Amino acid sequence: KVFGRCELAAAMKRHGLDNYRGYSLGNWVCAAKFESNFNTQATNRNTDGSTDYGILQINSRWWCNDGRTPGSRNLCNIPCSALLSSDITASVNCAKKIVSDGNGMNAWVAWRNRCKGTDVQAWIRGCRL
Ligand SMILES: CC(=O)N[C@@H]1[C@@H](O)[C@H](O)[C@@H](CO)O[C@@H]1O
Ligand SMILES: [Cl-]
Ligand SMILES: [Cl-]
Numbered sequence: 001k002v003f004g005r006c007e008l009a010a011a012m013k014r015h016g017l018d019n020y021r022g023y024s025l026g027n028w029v030c031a032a033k034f035e036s037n038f039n040t041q042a043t044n045r046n047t048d049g050s051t052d053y054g055i056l057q058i059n060s061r062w063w064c065n066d067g068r069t070p071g072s073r074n075l076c077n078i079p080c081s082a083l084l085s086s087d088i089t090a091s092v093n094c095a096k097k098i099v100s101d102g103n104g105m106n107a108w109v110a111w112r113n114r115c116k117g118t119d120v121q122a123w124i125r126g127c128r129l
């Protein structure tokens with residue numbers, strides 16, 4: 001599923017991401033925009049053999065199991081394929097664990113590079129919330 005901007009903002013809010021760990025909703029939408037382009041089926045293979053999955057590009061080295069990342073963890077206790085679903089519940093729950101890990105949203109390098117310090121509220125402007 002390719003989400004609309006305001007549709008994703010609304011689903012992210014309902015799953016409780018708005019101001020999670022102090023990160024306003026626009027931060028999460030911006031991150032999803034640049035990680036996945038709002039596509040829940042997005043995948044990216046990394047040089048270390050791991051793979052990023054889903055609307056928030058959660059990485060198999062630590063957070064999910066895909067059976068092909070040797071010496072990896074599954075801290076969110078899910079199959080990585082659950083992160084590709086049209087329903088973002090697993091992605092949101094796993095993002096809550098990632099962002100609580102000590103480095104906040106810098107865990108998403110696309111967020112640090114492309115969202116941090118910008119006008120992230122613009123990503124939810126004009127949305128019915
Ligand atoms: C939280 C998380 O797993 N982030 C990943 C991270 O591996 C990196 O920033 C990038 C690599 O392609 O994509 C994703 O954002
Ligand atoms: Cl915001
Ligand atoms: Cl594995």
Ligand SMILES: [Cl-]
Nearest residue numbers: 011086087088
């Ligand atoms: Cl959803």
Ligand SMILES: [Cl-]
Nearest residue numbers: 021103104105
């Ligand atoms: Cl923080």
Ligand code: NA
Nearest residue numbers: 060064072073
């Ligand atoms: Na893993």
